[PDB]
């Protein structure tokens, strides 16, 4: 049995592994937050395909990083919330997610200094304030 | 069998195209106080070594090949490894990719000895002064952040400074026009992956790999002034796998350029 | 009881059966709270030993209890035990609410008194403090936020940040000037944190931060300290990011603190959010950088405590799984160390237990099952697994992993650089790490060499240790002219680079080889540019070893002088003693390493005044637990090891050793066995511990050096917790031992003067050849270019030139005694020892070398030397000798011609003297008036062992006592022959072993030394042992560690080349001392005489053919010499003719012609061709071969006997047998047939009925196997193919002759006691029944390389040792008594009668050894191989005789393939089918 090699296939996976009742609670920014990382995931996921290019070595990026990262979302934005219905894309700890994934989760295996760089990269361009907007790019020019 | 013969062809192709012998280098005192001697003299020390073991592997498995003498347990293991075609262990002393085979392995070695060759030669020649000149190629030397590191240590006893306190800059240009600066060295066979550098500046692009006709290395004393944003950070690696990290290259982008565009596309700099 | 107060856990079953024994006694669980605790050494009582009142460290710092606990009222261990713990939690939350009260009163200041301050610092321990300086610091910097809530406010965290500034400015002032270590370790952890302190504070300013829950601030580790709560194990909270932790509040003592790399707090938030995350982490990464002690930051900062199970062969299971359920209760941490190294079954095991306790851990987000065991999982757990590049599977899952691939080493060097008062130190920093990165390159590499971080640790506090030194030097200077002074004004001119120049020279110049020195310049230079440094001499010593020097006869120099680079050593040596208390004087065997200490020693008692004491002991010639004492079973009663003994003894002060400087020397090798219980020694603490209890600390003048030749064996740690000096081979330079022997010389006379003036001229006459560029060191270093059999150590071979000089001596000295009316003049003295030089000069350069190697050395001698040489066109000058006139004369003068009796030829201890054994002769009666031992060297059977016995039964005064150095031989056998024929007697200098009569020097005679095993760390427990008697004429006495030197003894040994197999090359130090010299096979001019006395002295027997002895023999060299050419060893490994099988030969010919009276030429050359064949021919493998034997043999009886007719000399069926006549008469192939048929009819009426066919094959061996059991100790090996009738022809012969056939039963279950148990068997079976037996047993009878040791001991001596101990041999000793009561023989003791056992067992058991150098010319070889085409071509016919298979329609076919070549012309029916 292989996973299917696509992004759209990891995407799939992960927002049917991760419960609906999970994704779906007080802070209706929770559910981009989710989105927004299960796409890096998904792109680091399918990089590591490309081990000379993506990465330096095939790290070990399995599915309990991704558990741990939405343990992560979850438990931060719960601190940030104290129970409101909405919060503010400025109030979202940017920061604390961005160094988080940076060096405990999705960093803890990156034993090279420059695939940590290239993880900094990747997040500091995903996660941040700018995503909430409508013009928001996951991409430049694809094609 | 058959296997014992063309066994037998393979070992008598391969002590063919490998070269005879390795010239050693000769000690004097003030040859000794250059740190560039000093690498480049145990380079020779451990290639040397290393061709005579293999030459006389080959001598043997040849004799065996026709059956003056009989197969040892070290020579089971090398026989029955290279009819396998995986890389023996007493070969291969230096870092190699996993992958590489026999038959390719041996073909850089002869590479290897050739550049090894030229530069014993060129120091018989002369000396450290003419062996400061020398065009050397990072993938081709066994330890070349063996050679990075003398170069520092070259320049800074040449010119009376802390090794702390000197940086490296990169001169990308072509062997022909290029300039043997005092703190110039010349280094050969640098590839870049997914981007093309023009007069030191560096773009995008969907070629798979780009050569570089003669990288230039300079020591130059620390600035202490913070690097603009348009100079990026390039890791250099000495084979394809990546797996093992010589040093870093700091390079200027050229303009629209997004370094992080540049992180992304895994932009390196690969010796071989 | 395990249940209550788990903390016991830890210890051992034992140990807590040790602990309820020990219930009573409040002293003897002392080791149990160092085990137990995190730096608690004790708990301090009082005098009633009834309460508690404190608890102290390893250091010596101790925790005053708030509210003492009482014994009395608690009578119950547990009970008291965790009453003991929870006050000590109490108190130390109490007093850090004291500290931090104070903390908080002396910050937010603008100044600081320092008196106030440090006597704060006095007041709280080193971890109160450092906690307290956090949890102020972090009060202040979160205030100072709470301030910036309003935005942009105008920052206060300038004025925390200035507090900080003069605090450490403060810290920088006060660490400089002279304190008390604790009160230094205590600055140095809060410089530390402090520094770290500010450089967060400076990233707080740089970023601008605002708000408190900012998460740049969050991400720092933040104290919290609320004094309002109750209870006060939860009043200190730490949190950093999201996790937030309570403290352990466990008393740490003093622990080395870390330095807060980026890297390191990057796993510190990794760590905390892991177990916020209820999971562990595994912080792999290459070993070195700080990951396990990354892990143990971590749990001091929480005030946790961390377990360091080392993954080592020294991992085990129960005793792990115990103390990790222990864990389990308690609650404290655990870090395994390097986890790649368990074996897989280990790991696997390993790996369910700590998945187990990680899913209840996560449960607990609660009881598991350890060892059949529920127990509550304490939610402060955590467990750490690093690595060293992976996880296993079912781990993946539940750890996390980080990358340690690099420590900023800069920042640690800037962090503890400052911590030392260093000014500037990021540029020092900056410079040094870079350094130690180019150290770790471009020296060459060693074994010894360690350049990891903790050296770089290491270096700068020596460099700390070397700036308060000269600080101190320049207080005292100041103090002597003027009064000014000032520490910021001395520190300020003060330079610091000069400093850790100093301190790197001193460090890590030691260790280097000579050739690395300029390499450790030429960096120093390139980082260090413009700075230098050079060593204060120190001209008190240099003129005290000088003096002691001159006195000691030694050699002394001056830097570029002769010995120079040894005076240095001797210098770095006594420097590297004032700053470690722990030494390893590396190098090479006989470099500088025992004469250097003991000069150091000398010279310092002379200079210092206080006299030196050392206890020289080597480790590995005592067992480990002899070595440290041993454990009663019973009484747990403490006999002292050795080392533990003399430390005891310094320390209970009895005639004021403390006031003496005591070295003990570990001279020998080193292995992580027993250093492993001295660890606890080279490192801070200084103690020793004792199995038993009792502990020991070492005082200040205990000095521990290892006198240690390589350490490929020697643990990294156990390198890095000493010290080190190399002496490199070239530190003791050749001319330099020429002036240490030439003075010697000068000084000493021998006997113990007129011969020291004969040795004072002999010195003079020999003078010019020791000096520089000589004749003896040309001619060393050509015997270094040429090879030798045993590995050339130039110690040895100079010894063996001094040791024959000074026989020269004694010599000239015998022979003006034998002349006193005309003592020899200078010209003849002069000659002589010129001649008698050149002859100890090839004689120890060349003697362990072949012939012709012998011979080179000669020619390039004569070459290059001027002495007049023997003018013998050929004959080397080695064959020469000099006589007591001094002239050359040839050897062969010497040789006399003996004549054998003629009951006495070829008997095992008739020496018939030839050039090569009078040649030995003098070397053996040279070597041992100088009582220097010495070894034979020589393929086996050359002759060495009874052309020793020959020189030492005609040694007047010395009895010889052989002994069979076995695999197993240990220094044990050596004691009991040393009891056994000496005896301990007290002199005024000390215990003295001596032999028991009087007046006669033992020699120990060891047939093989180098047959004992060379241990995994590659040492030879005996023969140190003989090293250790022979260095130290002396050995220390196990059973009351005394030592006791040896007089009137000497060893001698024997050993075949190395090469062969089962032969250790001994270690070189074992060498150096005994000399070697090379006994080959004898040439063929000396085979000629020598077996020409043997064969004269046995035609004697009959007149008539007595003119025939000389051609025999030379015809029996020729054949002999052929098949040595021929036969190489390297067609086969059996393949070996030496001149015991010219023994053997003359030997079986003496058997032959002894009960017969007349026979002509022609019988005689039958019986020689008979033995020829079953001695040269009989083990060949090829049938090529043997017909080329065959024709060899017969051409030799034609050229060297031509009148003689050929075809009844050697016709073709040569067989010997007695069974038909009465006599051993040669018999008919046809009659002999008949006859062994017959017996055949009776062997299957009464044995086994299989038909046997009787092809000429089956005749020879059958033939031959009888003529090995009829002679005593017949054992034979029959190599041959399966089922070709190895076993059923060796039943035959055993039946036949009336043996008993014994074959052991095998299979899978057979293990080596069901085989001992057999051997004893038979042992008793033919030794005491006087019952014959033939042993037959098989390659599948041998399971077990062992069987085939046992096997090779028994025939090689005739009895193994090993097999009757105990009741059975008191029930050997009881059938022995019997048996020889029923023979005739009263013996009472045991060793006569064991002695009458082995030969009974020599004289009737007959083993035969069948298969498909040592049992090779020792037993018999035969090869049966296949049955050849007659053989086959019989049985068939034989068996295919009862069906019709003729033919008469049968027609012949033109043409047959005859494959049998004896086929009948006409083939028959049957014939061809046959065929
Ligand atoms: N300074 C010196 N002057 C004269 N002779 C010396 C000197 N130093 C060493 N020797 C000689 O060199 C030899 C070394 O002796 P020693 O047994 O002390 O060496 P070592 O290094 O301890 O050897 P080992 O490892 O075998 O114990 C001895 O013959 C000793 O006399
Ligand atoms: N953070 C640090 N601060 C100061 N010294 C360190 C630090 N990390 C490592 N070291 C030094 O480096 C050495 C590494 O020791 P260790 O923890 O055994 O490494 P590893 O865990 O990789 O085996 C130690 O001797 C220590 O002196
Ligand atoms: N000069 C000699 N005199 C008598 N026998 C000799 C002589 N040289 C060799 N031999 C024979 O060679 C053998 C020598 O080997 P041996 O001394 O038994 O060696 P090891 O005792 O070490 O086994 C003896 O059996 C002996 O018969
Ligand atoms: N000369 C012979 N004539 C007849 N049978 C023989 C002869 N030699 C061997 N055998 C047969 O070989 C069988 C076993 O031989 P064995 O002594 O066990 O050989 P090995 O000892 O080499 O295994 C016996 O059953 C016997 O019948």
Known sequence: ?143 | ?272 | ERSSFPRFYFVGDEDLLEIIGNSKNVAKLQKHFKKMFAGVSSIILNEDNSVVLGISSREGEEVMFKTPVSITEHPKINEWLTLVEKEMRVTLAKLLAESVTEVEIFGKATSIDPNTYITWIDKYQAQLVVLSAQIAWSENVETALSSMGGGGDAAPLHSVLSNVEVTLNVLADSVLMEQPPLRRRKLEHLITELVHQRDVTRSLIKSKIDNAKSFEWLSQMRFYFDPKQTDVLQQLSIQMANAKFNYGFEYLGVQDKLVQTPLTDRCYLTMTQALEARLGGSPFGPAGTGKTESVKALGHQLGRFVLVFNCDETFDFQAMGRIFVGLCQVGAWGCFDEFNRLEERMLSAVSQQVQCIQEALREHSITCELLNKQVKVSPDMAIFITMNPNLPDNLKKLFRSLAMTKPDRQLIAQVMLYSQGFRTAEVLANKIVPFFKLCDEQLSSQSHYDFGLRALKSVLVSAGNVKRERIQKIKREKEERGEAVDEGEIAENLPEQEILIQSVCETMVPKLVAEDIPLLFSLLSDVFPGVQYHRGEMTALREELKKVCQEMYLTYGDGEEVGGMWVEKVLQLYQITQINHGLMMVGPSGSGKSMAWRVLLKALERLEGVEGVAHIIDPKAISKDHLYGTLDPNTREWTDGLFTHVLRKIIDSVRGELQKRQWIVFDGDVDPEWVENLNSVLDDNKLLTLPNGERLSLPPNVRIMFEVQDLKYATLATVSRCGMVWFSEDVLSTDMIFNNFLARLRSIPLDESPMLQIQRDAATIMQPYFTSNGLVTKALEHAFQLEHIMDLTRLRCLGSLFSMLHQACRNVAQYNANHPDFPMQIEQLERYIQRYLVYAILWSLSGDSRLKMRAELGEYIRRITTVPLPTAPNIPIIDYEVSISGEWSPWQAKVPQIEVETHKVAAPDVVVPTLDTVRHEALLYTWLAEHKPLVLCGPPGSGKTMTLFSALRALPDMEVVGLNFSSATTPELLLKTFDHYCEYRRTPNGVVLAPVQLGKWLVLFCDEINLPDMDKYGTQRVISFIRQMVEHGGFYRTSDQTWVKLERIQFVGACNPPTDPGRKPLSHRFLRHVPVVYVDYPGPASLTQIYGTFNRAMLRLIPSLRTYAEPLTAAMVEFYTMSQERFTQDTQPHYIYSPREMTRWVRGIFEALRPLETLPVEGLIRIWAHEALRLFQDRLVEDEERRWTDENIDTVALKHFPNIDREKAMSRPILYSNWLSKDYIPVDQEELRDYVKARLKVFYEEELDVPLVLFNEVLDHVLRIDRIFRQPQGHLLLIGVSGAGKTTLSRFVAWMNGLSVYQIKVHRKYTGEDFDEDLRTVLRRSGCKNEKIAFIMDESNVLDSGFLERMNTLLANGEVPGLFEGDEYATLMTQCKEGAQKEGLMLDSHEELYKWFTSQVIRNLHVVFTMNPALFNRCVLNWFGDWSTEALYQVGKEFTSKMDLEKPNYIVPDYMPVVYDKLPQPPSHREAIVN
Not at chain 2, 110 to 116: G, V
Not at chain 2, 226 to 239: D, F
Not at chain 2, 241 to 255: G, N
Request: include cysteine.
């Open chain 2, 1 to 272: 069998p058959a296997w014992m013969r063309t066994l037998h062809t393979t070992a008598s192709n391969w002590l063919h195209l490998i070269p005879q012998t390795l010239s050693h280098l000769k000690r004097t005192v003030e040859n000794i106080k250059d740190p560039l001697f000093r690498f480049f003299e145990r380079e020779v020390k451990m290639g040397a070594k290393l061709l005579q073991d293999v030459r006389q592997d080959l001598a043997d498995v040849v004799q065996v090949c026709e059956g003056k003498k009989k197969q040892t347990n070290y020579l089971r293991t090398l026989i029955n490894e290279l009819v396998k075609g995986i890389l023996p262990r007493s070969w291969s002393h230096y870092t190699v990719p996993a992958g590489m085979t026999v038959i390719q392995w041996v073909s850089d070695f002869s590479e290897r000895i050739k550049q090894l060759q030229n530069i014993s030669l060129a120091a018989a020649s002369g000396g450290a002064k003419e062996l400061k000149n020398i065009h050397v190629c990072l993938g081709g030397l066994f330890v070349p952040e063996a050679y990075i590191t003398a170069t520092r240590q070259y320049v800074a006893q040449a010119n009376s400074w802390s090794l702390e306190e000197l940086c490296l800059e990169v001169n990308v240009t072509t062997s022909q026009g290029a300039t043997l600066d005092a703190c110039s060295f010349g280094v050969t066979g640098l590839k870049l992956q997914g981007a093309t550098c023009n007069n030191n500046k560096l773009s995008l692009s969907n070629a798979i790999s780009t050569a570089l006709p003669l990288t230039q290395l300079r020591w130059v004393k620390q600035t202490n002034t913070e690097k603009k944003a348009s100079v990026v950070t390039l890791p250099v690696y000495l084979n394809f796998t990546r797996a093992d990290l010589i040093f870093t290259v700091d390079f200027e982008i050229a303009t629209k350029e997004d370094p992080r565009s540049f992180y992304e596309r895994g932009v390196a700099v690969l010796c071989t």
């Open chain 1, 1 to 143: 049995f292989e996973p299917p090699p696509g992004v759209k296939a990891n995407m799939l996976r992960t927002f049917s592994s991760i419960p609906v009742s999970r994704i779906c609670k007080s802070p209706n920014e929770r559910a981009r937050l989710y989105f927004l990382l299960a796409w890096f995931h998904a792109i680091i996921q399918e990089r590591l395909r490309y081990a000379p290019l993506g990465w330096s070595k095939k790290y070990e990026f399995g599915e309990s990083d991704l558990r741990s990262a939405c343990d992560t979302v979850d438990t931060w934005l719960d601190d940030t919330a104290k129970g409101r219905q909405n919060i503010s894309p400025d109030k979202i700890p940017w920061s604390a997610l961005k160094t988080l994934m940076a060096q405990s989760i999705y960093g803890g295996r990156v034993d090279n200094e420059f695939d940590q760089r290239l993880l900094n990269t990747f997040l500091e361009r995903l996660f941040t304030t700018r995503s909430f907007d409508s013009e928001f790019k996951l991409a430049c020019k694809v094609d």
